[model samples]
Target chain A: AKLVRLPGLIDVHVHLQEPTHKEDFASGTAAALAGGITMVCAMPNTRPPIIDAPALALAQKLAEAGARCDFALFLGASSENAGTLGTVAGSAAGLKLYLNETFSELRLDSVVQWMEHFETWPSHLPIVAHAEQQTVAAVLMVAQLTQRSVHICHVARKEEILLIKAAKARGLPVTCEVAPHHLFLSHDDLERLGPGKGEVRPELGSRQDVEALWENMAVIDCFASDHAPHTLEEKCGSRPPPGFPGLETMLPLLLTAVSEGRLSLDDLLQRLHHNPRRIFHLPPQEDTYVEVDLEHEWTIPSHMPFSKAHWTPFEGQKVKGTVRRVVLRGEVAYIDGQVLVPPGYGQDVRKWPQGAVPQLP
Target chain B: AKLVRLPGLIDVHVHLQEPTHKEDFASGTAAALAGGITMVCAMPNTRPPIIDAPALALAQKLAEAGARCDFALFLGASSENAGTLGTVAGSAAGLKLYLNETFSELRLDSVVQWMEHFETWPSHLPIVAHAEQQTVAAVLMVAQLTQRSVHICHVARKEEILLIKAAKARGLPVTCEVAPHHLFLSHDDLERLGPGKGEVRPELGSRQDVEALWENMAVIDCFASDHAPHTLEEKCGSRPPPGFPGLETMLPLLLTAVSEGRLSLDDLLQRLHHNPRRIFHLPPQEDTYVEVDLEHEWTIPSHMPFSKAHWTPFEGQKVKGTVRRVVLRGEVAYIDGQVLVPPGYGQDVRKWPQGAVPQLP
Candidate 1:
């Protein structure tokens, strides 16, 4: 069959912690290109976490030199940097507020800290929070009190999504993203994946939660790949870290959902391109589009992914829609399951002037 | 402890099929008074369905001669009576269109039949429908197309309530009610109640569905008992009739939810009195109130209810709040465990002029 042209996708949540054995910008962005994601907004939970100018500069330097797909880095918000985030907010992607624990570095536990960050963060840019059930309501409360917007990351439960829908109906300035794992898997999958491979932040919710996410799909603003990569050895260790390597599988999984009539093509495009670009204030890439083979059906092979984790919970899953070729700024960046762009081909989206790519006709 | 005075509650969906082996007007209205409900709106799916004036008049005569609480009876809508229902709209309660099959007589399965009723029904009065899941959406679409309002009855699933929420948000003229059984029980309780006692229309949903009803509490406009009663032998028969005797236990179960902080007193009052009164366009009763002893907690006894059906699915369940006294038009109709009013004390609400009852201060 003929190819389907889609505007290159944007993933507003990904964790590409550089210089670690888990994942670096080089391999992570390579995975992004292969998956039809031309840009990824990276989270800031790295070692010497990206909180201040020095940490921000370190992460930026790594992405500038090693990423194959366009990228931007979020500045982590800490109690010490609450009022100081605005000084360097323009240089980063957006403020990343940790309201719940995934790792120990920058989690905000106090209401006072959340309030201060809500008050001081740049109004035009986003403040994406790692918030779960009770904390999702708390942060939404703070957003309402401060008249500020907050993008909830990895919304995983029925309670959380329904609350967000309520908030949106009340005209509160709130938006949210659902991780593919949370949408596609449930507690039932934990038995299939084993405890080690099953662990994730805002861990896989019940079958009810999965159905709720799909049911309330209209409220969701983006489809973020909280692409937190951890090595297979570390995942199988006695105490495994919580997260998944999702950059390479997000689009395929979403497309499979579309193929099965669970989602529409318009909904996918809005979340992947339009909403993420407008919410994050990122620049558009010219001549950037992905050629997808809609009829391509195959089982996922974990070992073939560009991520250094080299393993996936989605392994052996049958999926349709293959990213056949990707064009980045008029160049063939990826083709036939191969990433051809070099490490330095990706640029920082924040450095470019605000612009837009006309939607496909 | 002091008594909590509530405007005598209104149950807008009760099955009081007179002269039947199951339930009659006298016993059904007695059960209504015993449970703190002074106004009962009866459904029309008797042996000979109440779709025409003769059937409506017969049910009206039975209620007039043998009822103990204020009452109104809904006219069943069949394919044959869609265009003619307006002739008796002034005398009947809202039209009840069965979109899904509970029993055989009054159900409507075709879109043409639904559209006919939607177009011909009185605009000022509500049209309550027994629509579930997909039919819920289909009916809402008809409402939108016809620019009329609808009241969905006994919404028991997460999908149904959330879709109703979406319709309300989109400014669609749609309102919905949830039953107490659907709120308090799930598939898990089916094991405890057995298949015979567990059966009911829009049969119990999952624990997730129950949680969704609680979480999205704002979308629900009314709390209807859906008081469908069948005798013990019939329920336990080889082919059991699907229903529960809810008239006696609805208030107690709801108050228990209030005592547990799952629902607010304001929400209870709104659904029980204010909402049902407004939606059904029923005339308000004068000087009617119920005295409730909220702290009196006890186990539900199946044989104690005044309904002819001498059993309950809520058997042995612990509940708080007992109705101590009920006053109808300045007369003490029920005190402690006795009904003092004569069978003819109740009047048809349709015969009275339209009026309002001031909400409790």
Candidate 2:
């Protein structure tokens, strides 16, 4: 096949620390575009937590002013916020909860209180939960109680998937996301990378779980990058920061999976584009498209182009099918692995739909 | 059930370690009957090897005089004994080759040389080989040339089981035995036992392998207690010995298997008694019997068991059935967990039969 054009990917989970030394709006978006992503729902895990109304609004404005890709803002959830749930329901795209997150302050650590809060939340908005294997069952249990929808993020275990499967079968308004790393990597991979350098929250599972994720492909809603970046010192420490930079490798890995017969192109489009947009109620852009050279082979470079932290565990990983260009809002944002669109040209994902995004009073 | 009469258990693979620091004929036989086993085949890897006619003859005399249960002697094989193979066909129950033994000197480590030996040895006697997963295929390849039967000892890994399964499918004269440890214990179980004390030869495999041993029961021949014994001093060191005592725990574990539905009473009898007698061509003694209470529950203790090693890894293991009495060769050998028969009451295994086990002269 020649240049294969696909719908520009929508990654509903990413941790662009925004202003942290780890990653910023410009670099994160650049990495996103180079990998054929047109939009990202930025996670609420940064130094100044996006738990408050003002914090959520500021994060959106910063991305609106500086990001080179369309973006949606996730309102952080913690014990301190419940009164503001309805207030930010229309302003924020969704509620982001850290049920058992490693580097997150957006937490309701009191599981009873978390469930209580879920029981009282605004019914119209969906809540995105960062739940690990240990907490996913509780997350689903409470989701059953609440009238609102809940989206599980970066699910990594077979137990979690089974729980999610049963929850969906009951016709509950629930959707879930799995990360690229969870599908391909496992504890054996971690052991090879050693404990220090290969750590990640929602930790990698066993070979059995990794293989199951591929087989249960139909149930998983969409692919999320969970694109967290950390400095070398943060990553190489005794307790390394629990995430790897993933936005740049997600689509390439999926394309490689297509070549290897693990997944077909249709599965990729549904999980990366159609389902993500449907679950988030994301609007389509007229010219959001990406061109992929299905036959091209390339080794991932050690120096990631625009990601602040240039190191990645996927460095030197060989993949089939390379992303050649990304067309964002009828403009060429990236071409042949190079960022072409100027920063700040990207609009706020909420603002792109004109009158639909609710403005805070 | 009260006093359920069984077919009298037989263990074709056990290292009694007579004249060694671990165990002696008297102690080994006492342990055998207390677990409801009527007959035990003594391994040749004792203090003095039992290879030639004199060695085999002396071993038989020792067991006949001191053992409290019926016994058969296995003659160890070496590169020096191809001509003598015919002489032991009737005198010795079978030939035991330690292809990769831990404390054995009879190992034929050179694959090609071992195959050459198989190609030349007298093909009338049954050859019992101690083969690992790595060497079982080679063992089978060599078995094609030898017209005699080849039985695998302690088949552990799934790969070894599959190869043996295929060999049996092709109708090559092949059969295999698995130890109780391989069926029940795994590396994770060993890791919990603190490394030093949990080591066993043929190394316990993954949970997948342990489960498969139960699934492939139809093809697996008998259960052989690779019942090696080790002194506490020898076992607790930095470089401790590989195996722990097993004869006392083997039956209890299998009885527990019946309770857990892993195996049935018929499966146990088929493997422990019927199959061993048929493979070795040993005539059954109708007067020999074992009485078991199917509902009895017992906990194995840590104290010195009948067979020397004086210690057991299965210290606190719980089992469902208990052996109440064992009648050996028309004599009350063991009753109510007590050794009843005098040492000399135990006869040479050949006397239990008529006109079958002959002298080689």
Alpha-carbon interface RMSD for all candidates, in angstroms: 26.0, 34.1
DockQ of each: 0.02, 0.00
Error of 1 at B92 (Å): 52
> What is candidate 2's lDDT per residue for A1-361, written digit by digit as tens?
4677676688899889974689888889998998889988888877788888778778877887778988788887777787666766666667788888544566566778677668655554557888877688887778766645688998888988877766654445567889988887888677556676678878888999988787677568789888889877788887678888888898888989988878656567768876676566565555567888878888978767778877777776788877888888778899886898877877765654321321111
My TM-score estimates for the predictions, one after another, are 0.52, 0.49
Task: Report chain A TM-scores, every model.
Answer: 0.96, 0.94
The whole-model C-alpha lDDT of candidate 2 against the native structure comes to: 0.75
lDDT of 1: 0.83
Fnat for model 1 comes to: 0.02
TM-score of 1: 0.52
lDDT of 2 by residue, B1-361 (tens): 5556665688888888774567778888788888778788888877678877777778888888888877778877776765565655566667787888655557565776566557655444457888887788877877776544689998888888888877654446677899988887887677556677787878888988987787777668799888888787777887887876778788878988887877656567668875676566555554566777778787878853477888777777787777888877677787776798877666665554331332111
Q: Assess chain B of each prediction and give its TM-score.
A: 0.96, 0.93
| Weakest lDDT window of 10 consecutive positions for candidate 2 chain B | B352-361
TM for candidate 2 is 0.49
User: Model 2, DockQ value?
Assistant: 0.00
How far out, in Å, is residue B327 in model 2? 96
Show where candidate 1 strays beyond 4 Å. Answer: A355-361, B1-361
